[PDB]
Scaffold this active site. Structure first.
Site, mmCIF file in Angstrom:
data_model
loop_
_atom_site.group_PDB
_atom_site.id
_atom_site.type_symbol
_atom_site.label_atom_id
_atom_site.label_comp_id
_atom_site.label_asym_id
_atom_site.label_seq_id
_atom_site.Cartn_x
_atom_site.Cartn_y
_atom_site.Cartn_z
ATOM 1 N N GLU A 104 60.059 61.351 44.085
ATOM 2 C CA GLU A 104 58.740 61.933 44.253
ATOM 3 C C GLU A 104 58.902 63.395 44.606
ATOM 4 O O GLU A 104 59.870 63.777 45.267
ATOM 5 C CB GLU A 104 58.012 61.236 45.403
ATOM 6 N N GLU A 125 50.695 49.272 47.600
ATOM 7 C CA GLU A 125 51.710 50.241 47.219
ATOM 8 C C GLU A 125 52.748 50.291 48.331
ATOM 9 O O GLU A 125 52.377 50.285 49.510
ATOM 10 C CB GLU A 125 51.081 51.622 47.028
HETATM 11 O O1 LIG Z 1 47.072 55.592 33.130
HETATM 12 C C1 LIG Z 1 47.078 54.884 34.354
HETATM 13 C C2 LIG Z 1 48.287 55.520 35.151
HETATM 14 O O2 LIG Z 1 48.088 56.909 35.389
HETATM 15 C C3 LIG Z 1 48.477 54.753 36.434
HETATM 16 O O3 LIG Z 1 49.653 55.202 37.047
HETATM 17 C C4 LIG Z 1 49.753 55.011 38.420
HETATM 18 C C5 LIG Z 1 48.828 55.939 39.184
HETATM 19 O O4 LIG Z 1 49.139 55.902 40.612
HETATM 20 C C6 LIG Z 1 50.499 56.373 40.865
HETATM 21 O O5 LIG Z 1 50.632 56.393 42.189
HETATM 22 C C7 LIG Z 1 51.292 56.945 42.769
HETATM 23 C C8 LIG Z 1 50.150 56.342 43.801
HETATM 24 O O6 LIG Z 1 50.491 57.174 44.998
HETATM 25 C C9 LIG Z 1 51.024 58.328 45.234
HETATM 26 O O7 LIG Z 1 51.909 57.503 45.995
HETATM 27 C C10 LIG Z 1 51.469 58.383 43.929
HETATM 28 O O8 LIG Z 1 51.724 59.777 44.295
HETATM 29 C C11 LIG Z 1 50.300 58.091 42.981
HETATM 30 O O9 LIG Z 1 50.133 58.915 42.002
HETATM 31 C C12 LIG Z 1 51.467 55.452 40.262
HETATM 32 O O10 LIG Z 1 52.791 55.966 40.464
HETATM 33 C C13 LIG Z 1 51.228 55.269 38.753
HETATM 34 O O11 LIG Z 1 52.084 54.219 38.317
HETATM 35 O O12 LIG Z 1 48.702 53.417 36.120
HETATM 36 C C14 LIG Z 1 47.400 52.853 35.576
HETATM 37 C C15 LIG Z 1 47.305 53.489 34.211
HETATM 38 O O13 LIG Z 1 46.056 52.902 33.679
#
Ligand SMILES: O[C@@H]1[C@@H](O)[C@H](O[C@@H]2CO[C@@H](O[C@@H]3CO[C@@H](O)[C@H](O)[C@H]3O)[C@H](O)[C@H]2O)OC[C@H]1O
Ligand code: XYP
Length: 190
Positions: A177, A86
């Site tokens: 964000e 990420e």
């Molecule tokens: O349904 C699933 C989705 O919910 C999933 O989405 C990702 C989940 O992780 C997210 O991450 C950001 C990771 O880090 C912090 O930096 C963010 O605050 C997390 O929430 C990301 O943005 C989403 O794309 O994708 C998989 C699907 O199966």
């Protein structure tokens, strides 16, 4: 239009909108590369527009308004797979520096500012592949801005010099964000 969390393509731009299930956020896709976020006493969320897949040399342009009231950041945001990474190239932020707690790896100059680069390991956290463990890379602009162009290759190269191996690129967006805050933003990506 306004949408619940999800992904897709809108007017030729990929979008991703994710939240933690807390209320208080409204995410809207607009014409072309435009999206807006309006939030009030939110939880954790991140969303925006760009590309799926992204690339390792994209020059990403953004403009518009960014007015957080609390913890928030505006970034180029994306992932790779195999390995899972990420990454955030943070152009502006609100009341909290989101690299706090991450390990500083050095500095890079790009697009008119020095950036501090960092990484940290995320353990059993949400990701594009479900609950996962992965390194999270940061490049935080010292001279904050809400419009600009980002040469992503300068950041990828700076991170690589300290041990990043980027895998297969997944999505790559300009994202807003928020983290238990309020704000608005209206951003156009190209
Ligand atoms: O349904 C699933 C989705 O919910 C999933 O989405 C990702 C989940 O992780 C997210 O991450 C950001 C990771 O880090 C912090 O930096 C963010 O605050 C997390 O929430 C990301 O943005 C989403 O794309 O994708 C998989 C699907 O199966
Ligand atoms: O002009 C810019 C200088 O102000 C900044 O520190 O580093 C980048 C240059 O492109």
């Amino acid at each position: 239009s306004t949408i619940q969390p999800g992904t897709g393509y809108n007017n030729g731009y990929f979008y991703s909108y994710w939240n933690d299930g807390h209320g208080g956020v409204t995410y809207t896709n607009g014409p072309g590369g435009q999206f807006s976020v309006n939030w009030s006493n939110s939880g954790d969320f991140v969303g925006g527009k760009g590309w799926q897949p992204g690339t390792k040399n994209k020059v990403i342009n953004f403009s518009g308004s960014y007015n957080p009231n609390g913890n928030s950041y505006l970034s180029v945001y994306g992932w790779s797979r195999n390995p899972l990474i990420e990454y955030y190239i943070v152009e502006n932020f609100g009341t909290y520096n989101p690299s706090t707690g991450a390990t500083k790896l050095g500095e890079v100059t790009s697009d008119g500012s020095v950036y501090d680069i960092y990484r940290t390991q995320r353990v059993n956290q949400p990701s594009i592949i479900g609950t996962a463990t992965f390194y999270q890379y940061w490049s935080v602009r010292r001279n904050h801005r809400s419009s600009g162009s980002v040469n992503t290759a300068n950041h990828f190269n700076a991170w690589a010099q300290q041990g990043l191996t980027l895998g297969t690129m997944d999505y790559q967006i300009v994202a807003v964000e928020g983290y238990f805050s309020s704000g608005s933003a209206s951003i156009t990506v190209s």
